[PDB]
Design a binder for this molecule. Structure first.
Ligand SMILES: CC(C)CCn1c(CN2CCN(C(=O)c3ccco3)CC2)nc2c1c(=O)n(C)c(=O)n2C
Ligand SMILES: CC(C)CCn1c(CN2CCN(C(=O)c3ccco3)CC2)nc2c1c(=O)n(C)c(=O)n2C
Ligand SMILES: [Cl-]
Ligand SMILES: [Cl-]
Ligand SMILES: [Cl-]
Ligand SMILES: [Cl-]
Ligand SMILES: [Yb+3]
Ligand SMILES: [Yb+3]
Ligand SMILES: [Yb+3]
Ligand SMILES: [Yb+3]
Lengths: 494, 494, 494, 494
């Protein structure tokens, strides 16, 4: 069931959110927000800069002080606030999904049925952890009582990408708040709108002021201010590996703040000859084409065993030729635009390298339409490992299909990348499923599926695809700081 | 009981250790190793550089390959090798403690009774974790079987300080090996000798070649090579906050390798009027003067409530006037030298600032002897928060004593530092013990004691005193990399 | 704020609840339910027997079958159903608290502000665990992949006491359902009504049929049927140690079903001379008099150091003389009736032993009123360890106060009982707080408080006060069954 | 490599072991110990009774008192003692394996290579847990500091079976001692000798007196004394389900002591048509015939899909016809005797039911030899579910092979038993491996293997095959007792 909003969307929240109030930029400057399907301006939003980040950090620091409402409230009450926030997002599901679709160029069916469902489910999952974050009592040598506190770290700077604005906002704030941190959030310059609406709901849910602060603005200004700030305890960032490197450097040069990064991928799939072929084709297809290819985990290198390679390519091409391009709000449309010009240019440049370096173009290969940042869904076969399209994250609707004969060799090829976010293995062989998944240098490995992500599972990269994990039990670790307390006693007993 | 070595120590192991063999430097260069008590040369050791680090990383990468002996052996067998290594260190306890004392300027009683005991106990603790590192099975949404593997990360670069060469070597290699990593270790240029002897014992214990590689050499050459290497997965470093910042930057600029840091401190103690005064004096004393003040956790700011301040200072000064300076090998000697000239100069410069900025010198305040890097044990009272001796890590035998009247204010003062490694609270009040320890921004808080460190407890800094934790259950986390494996199934059941 | 119900309570749900429908007893028999404040009949309820338990177990077995809705639904959806049930209980808070007060003789303020709040909070806590119950992946010796599943056990028989009917219903069903079990619940014969209303809400919330089945009836018939049933996997029981012994025997003689028991106490407090005296008096007072003394954790032996004993007794007696006895529904009334005649008789018999064995009666000592099972709040001083009132659980408003001079001796006296549910320690001494609490043989030890119970903490007895723990992370263990799965693989890697 | 003892075994330790000394029985009575291969008397051992169990419990209670050496020593030192004990068992490996083989009728190769290796490995595993048993710090509602202690339970009665005397002794004492309990051990009347030798090694290793006490004697006397004792906190028992029921009853009737049970099985294997047939035959074969069938996990019902059934039976019969019966000490002998006359009679009676109820005898079916309790290895095909040999644990070298066509039906048949210890699934289908193993009601499920048991994995039964788990992380839970300590504080902070 796909219900829709019955009135035109009106944009209300366009200002900086600090201490549960709306602020103009210190500059007085604003910046435009565009719709990528029409190239039209949707509205202007206050442009946050270093001066505004400083106000937000001061607010978050004050909300984190010992004795404050956020520090002293029961853990179970932090959980309650998060479950309330999920209920409010559920209440505003139609408007949020519309806004997400309109600002982000995201298919409305996916926005409503997947992104919003995921936001709500993830918030509810995180809410359940709040009063279940525990330290330890430890049988130390000598006559001492030793325990640990898993405290919140403090003020967390969180830089959110444009590809999944609402989902990634919640993946960041859910665990951070559950653990008792305060946050300064910088949504993507392309997509600040849904975050600002969520801020209105944070205020409505009853979070104490300064617990969540949202500063829309640009990467090289507001993002750099966050990453270099002397009083931000931790920075979380999702986006390009290139910017990830700058964040990690700036944290080092400033105040040695903790850093977690979810970055690019060039994720491989390995399709063995014994695989359920149709299942592999469909998952690998969705794996690379989901959200116009604008996913870190895009299955952007598909290695298929020689004997089923031709059949795999044929079936893949026929699936890729079935899309309907257009405005992501219109029912039945199955491919929206890319987010902006830079991304659009990068994709087209990479598609040209595939042609020029001698990959076989099966379909697509150019732009589409008179308006919007649309790229035809593109398939390349006979791709080799040295090609630009085999090495660089495209972040567009561009599928690479390669052949292999040797399993030893294809695992090396799969692993022969600085990336390491995810991988897929398609086989009916139990031993191969376990041994291949163990040998792949990737944070998540799917077996006979692809792109299955849930709140209960930790998610993150090996190698240059990231540092740390988000979600699951393990993800909550990087939002706590462990303190050991050791007390002298006259005599200990087991 | 303090037994001693019956024959003069002969130095045997002076070369680079790669793939369980001894190598000359690619350069052919060597560097001198000095005794800090005599200023005499002990021997020459092969100088490792980028070229030699590259050989060690290649060896560690090869030992980490899927299907290798170190990857395929039972976890319990990794544990067995570590327990064997502890037995061998126990066997060579007299020679190791002598070597440590002679190279490191460390009191032999402490070297033998504390450092060596700690090495052996920590190795045994780590050995027990090897087959107890477990992932999870997770009740993910949808029809899937999801589990996690807590894999080793891979090749870990480990840069060891000069203050506790053997203890810190084991704090690094114990957990890394227990978890199944391979290591490239760079001992301090001042103190490579005990590490090279341990390398001989790693070979004897039966570790596969390339699992542990030890490259003596300099920070700006070998250390920088490690931190900037494109095929090192993780770097662990203990030392100055200043160098810590360079490590974190270089990791960012190179390959986004994981980084854990244990850095400086300016650790405070808070002594309430109701404290057991003698107990507080003794622990705070040892807290700052241990190993000639060359401890990250030095209790280098002691805040004492006004009404007991004078009595605290008097009792502290009388304890500090009881040392016997000399060669750390001679029985009854209770203070050895500082490690080298740079450290010696820094300490003397800081002692001069205390005098010039108007702190009250109670005892000490200058050098001692005609040879060696000896500093008189020094006490300053009436220290204020703006003084250099109150802000900068001295890393020398220099005690600062300050007064307070307000508990609110003194916690702010205690926390008013970029450091955050440890703290001490001395009180008989249950509520104060719990509330003060919660409010202090420090990784370890001791109550009615100080400097109590054990293998069972996680250890590390808040703020610029470090990133991550070592030892305990929690410390083992930063030597694993979590992989999620998600398998499509027809139907799941709880 | 104490809001109240605006219309007279009408009783609606009086039948057996199996497969989400209302059933008459197979017998056609019914039994009366009384109000203990008036001795008046409130209604008749269907009397369940072995024949009816058999129907409920068949329903629970069927709902637990592989492939069923309850087995196949997402863990997060079990959580959702539990959070929905808490919302519904919150919606019906006024009627449930009134019903609880009227049927259970429980003060309405406590029923509304404590019991109902606790039900809702505990359900919400349990809901959060549902998708966080995880097994392990284990580095077994040899070439195998080994993981564990923490499965639900299956059909759980749950026998609920009359003292906290709603709270204990939720303490039982919350964790059992969160873990994925199905349940057959036998509320106390005295207090079936609130459970049957909750059953109506389980149906409304959308739980699949047969997941929760509620069979009102008698202990020796329905309770014995549960404990002896050949197809019930686990029995949970809270009540007398005497009946606890019969349950454990019957489980042994039948099908070796798992057993957890929360039984009686004779919980001691130790009040040191340095204690905050007023704080100790108030907590020890509420500790023994809460809900007319009808709490397993009643602080029924208070040991006070000689020098403050007289002052403690005086202050205790003055607090005990301030109650207003009456109908628990009338505002300002501060003591309701005992639950029934058997309990009333037992209490009066025990009070008579105190007088006859030579305890000093400070106040109370007899019945009150012309209707209802009221006992005057009673205090005895100079109680000695051999007295019946010092050995037997009274389960009434009867406080015992004893003196001690030796701490060694008083810990022995405190521990010298077959019971072991809880204990209290009142002192300002950190060392004493830690060492005494370690030495006491009791499941929960309170320091400078008493009777503090929360969903986040495991709760249960040492010795004959119980087997197992409820609530907290640890309590969820006894509602799972661990299955190890070990898979042969060609080669394992760490 | 199978080394052997170079001198005849002399029996030395034949007395009751209490407080690290050797005691005669209070009665002065002794009982004979026989060799099952020759039926000859090996020696006489002191017969312990209730009077002797009382002495052992008093010793264990005293060793468990607060302030005792076992309670106050560092957890790491409990670990050290256990690793020392493993080294001593390793030192005495030849004599222990010989003694085990001679007393227990166990093949010497297995005794030496499996049983002794398993004892040593399990002890070492347990030693590693000692200082890694941790409680929690918990974010309770309200202004409180709450932590838990995972204390030892206290005096644990441990009743050891005759089939794996040394392995099961260590499976019991390893975890119990690691957790800090004291034990009263009752080895099997048939096989007390290896336990008494281990007791000599417990004394030599330096365990404090009263920590381990060993009382040889009979089940209905010494075993019943243990199970009914008013001051034993916990009883662990491995043996028949029948006696398991008596233990659980007696615990209920006496002092509600905690009970863990590992009991019989009638463990099924399911062999799908797509299985590696030879691998399935070999594992199922060893699965049922290991140690003369005297294993709780015996694969005593093998269900094979119709199309491969005949081939499975043929290959099974040819493997079963290859044994060499004789004295378990002679090299090349591959089947020893059954333990005693009762077991021998039960096996022969059951083999007769198979013949008489119409199972097809493929080989064996009678006794062997002029001395010893030898049974010919026996195979029955065309077994049906109602046959005695399909329902009753034989505990002898008797293999049952059944056919199936329907997977739904065979899972029901597999589960249609009151037992539930283990199961095996043989298939090449990933989905079937996961779904079948989830659906089987068994504590351990092997996939493409059988009988793989390791220290790292929890082990125990569903249903009437047991209560609780041994070994792994999870097994350590049933040797601790959780105490919650909740401390009033002025203000809590996260
Ligand atoms: C990691 C991101 C980039 C994943 C974006 N994405 C999604 C939709 N997601 C967003 C919402 N998210 C949740 O928060 C959640 C919590 C509980 C259940 O879901 C689930 C994943 N579906 C996908 C993909 C995808 O990136 N690829 C490649 C695919 O193939 N499919 C099918
Ligand atoms: C953190 C380092 C710099 C601590 C160096 N240090 C030591 C001796 N240590 C080295 C060996 N170490 C262990 O590995 C261990 C494992 C199990 C038991 O001990 C224990 C701590 N004792 C100290 C101090 C110290 O730095 N300060 C300030 C003190 O006051 N005391 C008493
Ligand atoms: Cl911890
Ligand atoms: Cl995990
Ligand atoms: Cl487990
Ligand atoms: Cl716990
Ligand atoms: Yb254009
Ligand atoms: Yb000099
Ligand atoms: Yb009456
Ligand atoms: Yb015979």
């Amino acid at each position: 069931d796909l219900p829709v909003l019955l009135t035109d969307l009106k944009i209300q929240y366009t200002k900086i959110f600090i201490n549960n109030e709306w602020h103009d930029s210190v500059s007085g400057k604003k910046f435009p927000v565009f719709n990528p399907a029409t190239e039209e301006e949707l509205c202007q939003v206050e442009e946050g800069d270093k001066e505004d980040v400083d106000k937000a950090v001061k607010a978050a620091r004050q909300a984190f002080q010992i004795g404050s409402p956020w520090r002293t409230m029961d853990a179970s009450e932090r959980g309650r606030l998060l479950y309330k926030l999920a209920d409010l997002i559920e209440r505003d599901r139609l408007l949020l999904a519309t806004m997400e679709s309109m600002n982000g160029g995201k298919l409305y069916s996916n926005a409503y049925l997947s992104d919003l469902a995921g936001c709500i489910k993830t918030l509810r999952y995180c809410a359940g952890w709040a009063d279940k974050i525990q330290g330890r009592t430890i049988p130390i040598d000598g006559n001492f009582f030793t325990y640990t506190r898993h405290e919140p770290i403090g003020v967390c700077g969180q830089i959110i990408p444009w590809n999944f604005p609402l989902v990634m906002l919640i993946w960041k704030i859910g665990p951070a708040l559950s653990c008792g941190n305060t946050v300064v959030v910088k949504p993507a310059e392309q997509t600040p709108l849904t975050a600002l609406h969520v801020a209105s709901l944070i205020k409505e849910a009853g979070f104490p002021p300064g617990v969540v602060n949202i500063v829309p603005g640009y990467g090289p200004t507001a993002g750099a201010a966050i990453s270099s700030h002397m009083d931000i305890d931790k920075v979380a960032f999702t986006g390009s590996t290139e910017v990830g490197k700058l964040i990690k450097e700036a944290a080092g040069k400033s105040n040695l703040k903790r850093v977690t990064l979810e970055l690019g991928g060039k994720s491989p799939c390995i399709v063995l000859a014994d695989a359920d072929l149709d299942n592999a084709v469909e998952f690998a297809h969705h794996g690379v084409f989901y959200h116009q290819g604008q996913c870190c985990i895009a299955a952007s290198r598909i290695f298929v065993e020689e004997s089923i390679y031709d059949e795999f390519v044929r079936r893949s091409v026929e699936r890729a030729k079935k899309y309907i391009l257009g405005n992501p709000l219109t029912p039945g449309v199955t491919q929206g635009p890319q987010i902006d010009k830079e991304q659009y240019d990068k994709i087209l440049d990479l598609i040209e390298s595939g042609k020029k370096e001698g990959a076989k173009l099966e379909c697509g290969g150019g732009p589409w339409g008179n308006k919007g940042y649309f790229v035809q869904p593109t398939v390349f076969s006979n791709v080799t490992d040295e090609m630009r399209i085999a090495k660089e994250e495209i972040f567009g609707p561009v599928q690479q299909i390669m052949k292999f004969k040797s399993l030893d060799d294809v695992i090396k090829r799969a692993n022969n990348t600085f990336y390491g976010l995810s991988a897929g293995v398609f086989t009916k062989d139990i031993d191969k499923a376990i041994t291949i998944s163990s040998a792949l240098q990737a944070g998540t490995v799917w077996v006979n599926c692809y792109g299955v992500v849930s709140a209960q599972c930790p998610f993150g990269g090996f190698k240059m695809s990231g540092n740390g994990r988000e979600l699951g039990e393990y993800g909550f670790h990087e939002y706590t700081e462990v303190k050991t307390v050791t007390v002298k006693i006259s005599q200990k007993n087991s």
